[PDB]
Amino acid sequence: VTLQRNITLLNGVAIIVGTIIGSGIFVTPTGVLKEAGSPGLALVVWAACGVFSIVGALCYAELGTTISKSGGDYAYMLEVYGSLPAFLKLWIELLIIRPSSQYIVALVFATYLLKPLFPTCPVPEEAAKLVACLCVLLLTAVNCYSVKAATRVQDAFAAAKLLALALIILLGFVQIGKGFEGTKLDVGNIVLALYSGLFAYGGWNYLNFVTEEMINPYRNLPLAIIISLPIVTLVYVLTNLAYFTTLSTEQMLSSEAVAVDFGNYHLGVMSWIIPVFVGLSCFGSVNGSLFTSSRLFFVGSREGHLPSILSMIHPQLLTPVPSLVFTCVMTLLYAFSKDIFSVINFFSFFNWLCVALAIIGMIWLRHRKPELERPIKVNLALPVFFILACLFLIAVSFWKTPVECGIGFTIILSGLPVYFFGVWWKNKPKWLLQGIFSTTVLCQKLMQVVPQET
Amino acid sequence: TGLSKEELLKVAGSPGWVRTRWALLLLFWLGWLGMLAGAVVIIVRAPRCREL
Ligand SMILES: N[C@@H](Cc1ccc(N(CCCl)CCCl)cc1)C(=O)O
């Protein structure tokens, strides 16, 4: 069997717009405004970080249609830097970046969804963790049954976000109808203000991790980026403009969840509307992050980096069942760690590093292989502008927050041992090979799954 | 590398394995419903925030 190309142009938009927006816009603005220090300059960095996002994604629109392959930012460096550099990324994406991101966003789903049953006090931890995990389990099942089901789910919760942010913008314009100061302009500060948007816009690369599942990627991938990411930019500046109609700097810079207080200010009878919409927003972000992660671990196994259980597909339903089950188990195993919001911050920069290495690889390929076909090309200034902007922002981390870095960098270096034993060694002891094969065929028999035919 | 497709056809249709999948795809859904009932019990058996 082979994975059929079920993602339409519209579903391709819902994969990206439905996973960019997530929790970011409804909880982040306080953390922009703390470093901007002014409602004038805050609305500047929200646009400027948008521009950085468009030029980044436009580099990925090219890169993805030059390679024309589903492994996203892993494939696009495997084709360049080779086996071990791609493995270091894959190990980190498999063990840390993606299980943590799924789990915390599933937690954001739970804690906001329960919030109107606990309006003024923290929701109980067991209820949050159960509800978070029930989300990850249910979405895994939906992703196992049908690509058609999971993509038609992704529409609903892409729409849910745009409806929620439409409700924010609607209330904002209603307050304008009813009826730059203080700025901390320091050249060494405002770069940290721009960094705050690279949680809120982050995720525009997700559509590249599913390239081989779009109906006609040479049109759909660049077009879905160009339809999506400018719309997000517009929605964010209008959404922040809306918040600044209602909440003063002193409210916004202190408040826990700016959109919920905005909801309480206007919608007194039904104030739970925004809390539940931030919840449902997150449910779609998890779905997309889970769908998209499954493809990475699957692709990694084709190209020889991971055990050959994860390359298998279920013949009756045509989904990479072992990859989704692995994704889920590895995410639920993450849930009981304590200091997660340190973890995902000290690894925050590793995503930007890899995005930079990918577009560096794209220019290195435009030198070494003019032989490759390129159905769309970008003028080389934009990549160079984008790599300058990336490597500038990586450097900020080591000025403002270097202290954690060794704990993260230890795991990156811990990728090398596992590469040698798992991939370079080729399993010389035949008793270990028989154990691997035994383990494999148990999964085969159990899940009813088989390798892909090209 | 793992097992052949056409090799797997010889084993995967055995009643033992079909009964095994029927049991597990019941036990997963049952276990999810277990966590759901659990979560609802936590939400009942917890002290509500005092009003302002
Ligand atoms: N905008 C998102 C948040 C987000 C952004 C970037 C990442 N990534 C890694 C840094 Cl945690 C990208 C690779 Cl998973 C993950 C999550 C939302 O609001 O759901």
Walk me through this protein's architecture.
Chain B: It comes from Homo sapiens. The complex is a heterodimer of chains A (454) and B (52). By secondary structure, chain A is mainly α. Chain A has helices at residues 9-20, 24-27, 29-36, 39-67, 72-78, 83-114, 125-145, 147-178, 187-195, 197-200, 217-246, 249-254, 258-266, 273-302, 321-332, 340-346, 348-368, 381-400, 405-413, 415-424, 430-447. The longest helix of chain A is centred in the first third of the chain and has 32 residues, at 83-114. Chain B has 52 residues and is mainly alpha-helical. Chain B contains 2 helices and no strands. Classes of the chains: A mainly alpha (454), B mainly alpha (52). The A-B interface holds A 114, 117-121, 124, 126-127, 130-131, 133-134, 137-138, 141, 308-309, 312, 315, 437, 440-441, 444-446, 448, 450-451 and B 1-5, 8, 11-12, 17, 20-21, 24, 28-29, 32, 35-36, 38-39, 42-43, 46, 48-52. The structure holds melphalan. Melphalan (VUC) is lined by residues 20, 22-24, 97-98, 101, 105, 199-200, 202-203, 285, 344, 348, 351 of chain A.
In short:
The complex is a heterodimer of chains A (454) and B (52). Chain A is 73% helix and 0% strand.
Biggest sheet statistics of chain A = none
Q: What's the Cα radius of gyration of chain B?
A: 21 Å
Biggest interface pair, residues each? A-B, 29 and 27 residues
Could you state the order of secondary-structure elements of chain A as H and E? HHHHHHHHHHHHHHHHHHHHH
Helix segment tally of chain A: 21
Query: Outline of chain A, from the CA principal axes?
Result: globular
Number of helices of chain B: 2
How far apart are the termini of chain B?
64 Å
Structural class of chain A: mainly alpha
Q: What share of residues of chain A is helical?
A: over 70%
How would you classify the quaternary structure? Answer: heterodimer
Task: Identify every distinct bound molecule in the structure, by name, code or SMILES.
Answer: melphalan
- Determine the strand fraction of chain B and express it as a percent band: under 5%
Q: Total strand count of chain A, please?
A: 0
Order of helices and strands of chain B: HH
Specify the helix fraction band of chain B.
over 70%
What structural class should be given to the helix and strand makeup of chain B? mainly alpha
Content of β-strand of chain A: under 5%
* Shape by Cα distribution of chain B: rod-shaped
What value does the Rg of chain A take, in angstroms? Answer: 22 Å
Give the termini separation of chain A.
8 Å
PDB class: transport protein
Keywords: Complex, Cancer, transport protein
Assembly: dimeric
Entry title: Structure of LAT1-CD98hc in complex with melphalan, focused on TMD
